[PDB]
Amino acid sequence: MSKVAIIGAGPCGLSILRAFEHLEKKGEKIPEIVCFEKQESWGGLWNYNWRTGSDQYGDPVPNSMYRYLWSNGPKECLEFADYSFDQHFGKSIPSFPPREVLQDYILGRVSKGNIKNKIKFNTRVINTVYRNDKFEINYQDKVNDKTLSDTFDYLVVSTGHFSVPFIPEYEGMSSFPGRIMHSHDFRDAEEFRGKNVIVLGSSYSAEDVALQCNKYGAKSVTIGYRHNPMGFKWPKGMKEVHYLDKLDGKKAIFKDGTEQDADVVILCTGYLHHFPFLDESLKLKTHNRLYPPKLYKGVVWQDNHKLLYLGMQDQFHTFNMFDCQAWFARDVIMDKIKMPSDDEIDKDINKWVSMEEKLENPDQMIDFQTEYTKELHNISDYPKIDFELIRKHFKEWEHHKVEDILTYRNKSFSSPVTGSVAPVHHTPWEKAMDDSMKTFLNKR
């Protein structure tokens, strides 16, 4: 009899819609659910959008994915327990597919039934306050340029945290004559063919963007790190150096003495958790990390147990962790799972936060999120999936990347759901210039 709002229809919002659909299909009555999505269609980050900055309605563009993007982790690590790769594709496919393939899989899971009709598209939530036991929500109908309002018993926030970029200033940028952009702006790497590219950062975006620039013909790619190099085996035309000091006209000067002519600077400097549409009292505030505090089981807002955040952690696991989070949130909403005492909640948060702060390397992090996700898995009825296999997969994958960053996407992993072994793709990733699902799924 309650009414539930979901903000965002990407993997997380879809996860919980799907979780609810499971109950409805079994004949259980479920709450009225309204899902708000600022994009014109579902899929979240998995939708490619040529647009950058802000859209035709002045709404910031949430899309960060670029042309030629391929899965950067084993697809087997992100398989849906309730909708296997085998079921969706009707056959085994390689472990690292291009974006369109995974998008098709994501949307395939939810496109059979009534989920889509629950989503309001081109609709942007803009204000949220909790009053008299309800979330009062204002949202802009963008096409009509009109503010609407409604009231909900539960609010699920699933707006991700890789859309609003963090963009630091470096000396000399105000006089730089080339392009300065953030990875969030990166669209078609062909833009930089024949150009000298600087990328700043040391995580997945710096890694992949640098590779894409080289793959699509950049004259050179120079990666600057502040703390430690990524240290991967970069191919010719790429180097990694310590810390941009300044841009001096067309010249990038680093603290280790390196000087490099630069045509473009790409800041792969991460993203903000950004919730302008939430009251200060409801608003999660954190940097990107495996376990922000104030989130019971990493989902329930400590100070308001009817506000639930999905997907807000930094990510090794993704789709099936979102699922475990969503099933949990569903069950909290349905009063299947009961909230422990304030003291126990706080103690449990501190237990995980304390573990999280001591993590020293990717192996410990993988183990951490594995245990986090498995604990969630055990408190609801999300179907069988082998998180122990996924643990090993992630570790093997990390070793592949250090072995050879160019070929890790050529490796094969087994499904933690069906056991199916992924075949080796008909094209090595380092040579695969065509990123279409058609080219991928069909014979060479």
Ligand X SMILES: Cc1cc2nc3c(=O)[nH]c(=O)nc-3n(C[C@H](O)[C@H](O)[C@H](O)COP(=O)(O)OP(=O)(O)OC[C@H]3O[C@@H](n4cnc5c(N)ncnc54)[C@H](O)[C@@H]3O)c2cc1C
Ligand Y SMILES: NC(=O)c1ccc[n+]([C@@H]2O[C@H](COP(=O)([O-])OP(=O)(O)OC[C@H]3O[C@@H](n4cnc5c(N)ncnc54)[C@H](OP(=O)(O)O)[C@@H]3O)[C@@H](O)[C@H]2O)c1
407 near ligand Y (CB under 6 A):
no
Q: Which lies closer to a second copy via its Cβ, residue 287 or residue 351?
A: 287
Q: Quick one: which of 12, 115, 223, 284 contacts ligand X (CB under 6 A)?
A: 12
Burial class (CB in 10 A: 0-12, 13-18, 19+), 295: buried
Close Cβ partners of 132 (under 8 Å, ≥ 6 residues apart): none
69 near ligand Y (CB under 6 A):
yes
The reply to whether 117 sits in an annotated binding site is: no
Q: Quick one: which of 62, 94, 160, 201 contacts ligand Y (CB under 6 A)?
A: 201
Start-to-end C-alpha separation, the chain: 53
The reply to whether 269 sits in an annotated binding site is: no
Q: Which lies closer to ligand X via its Cβ, residue 5 or residue 264?
A: 5
Q: Quick one: which of 26, 50, 236, 433 contacts a second copy (CB under 8 A)?
A: 50
Q: Quick one: which of 95, 202, 315, 370 contacts ligand X (CB under 6 A)?
A: 315
Ranges within 89-128 binding ligand X (CB under 6 A): 124-125
Q: Quick one: which of 26, 227, 338, 443 contacts ligand Y (CB under 6 A)?
A: 227
DSSP 381-406: -PPP--HHHHHHHHHHHHHHHHH-TT
Provide the residue type at 133 as one letter: D
Pick the stretch among 40-48, 173-181, 261-269, 366-374 that binds ligand X (CB under 6 A): 40-48
Q: Quick one: which of 6, 20, 30, 64 contacts ligand X (CB under 6 A)?
A: 64
Ranges within 273-302 binding ligand X (CB under 6 A): 277
Provide the residue type at 284 as one letter: L
**DSSP β-bridge partners for residue 216:** none
**DSSP β-bridge partners for residue 157:** 7, 309
Close Cβ partners of 298 (under 8 Å, ≥ 6 residues apart): 291, 292, 309, 312, 313, 325, 352, 372, 376
Close Cβ partners of 331 (under 8 Å, ≥ 6 residues apart): 337, 379, 380
Residue 120 near which of ligand Y, ligand X, a second copy, none (CB within 5-8 Å, type-dependent) = none
Give 171's DSSP letter: T
What H or E segment, with its residue span, contains residue 12?
A: helix 11-26
The reply to whether 170 sits in an annotated binding site is: yes
Chain breaks after residues in the chain, where C lies over 2.5 Å from next N: none
Q: Which lies closer to ligand Y via its Cβ, residue 14 or residue 119?
A: 14
72 near ligand X (CB under 6 A):
yes
Cβ at position 139, least distance to ligand X in Å = 7
Cα(269)–Cα(249) distance, integer angstroms: 22
Q: Which residues are annotated as a binding site for NADP(+)?
A: 70, 72, 170, 202-203, 205, 226-227, 288, 409
Instruction: List binding-site positions for FAD.
Output: 12, 37, 39, 45-46, 72, 125, 315, 318
The binding site for a second copy (CB under 8 A) comprises 48-58, 60, 67, 126-127, 140, 145-147, 164-169, 173-182, 184-185, 187-188, 190-191, 263-264, 272, 274, 276, 280, 285
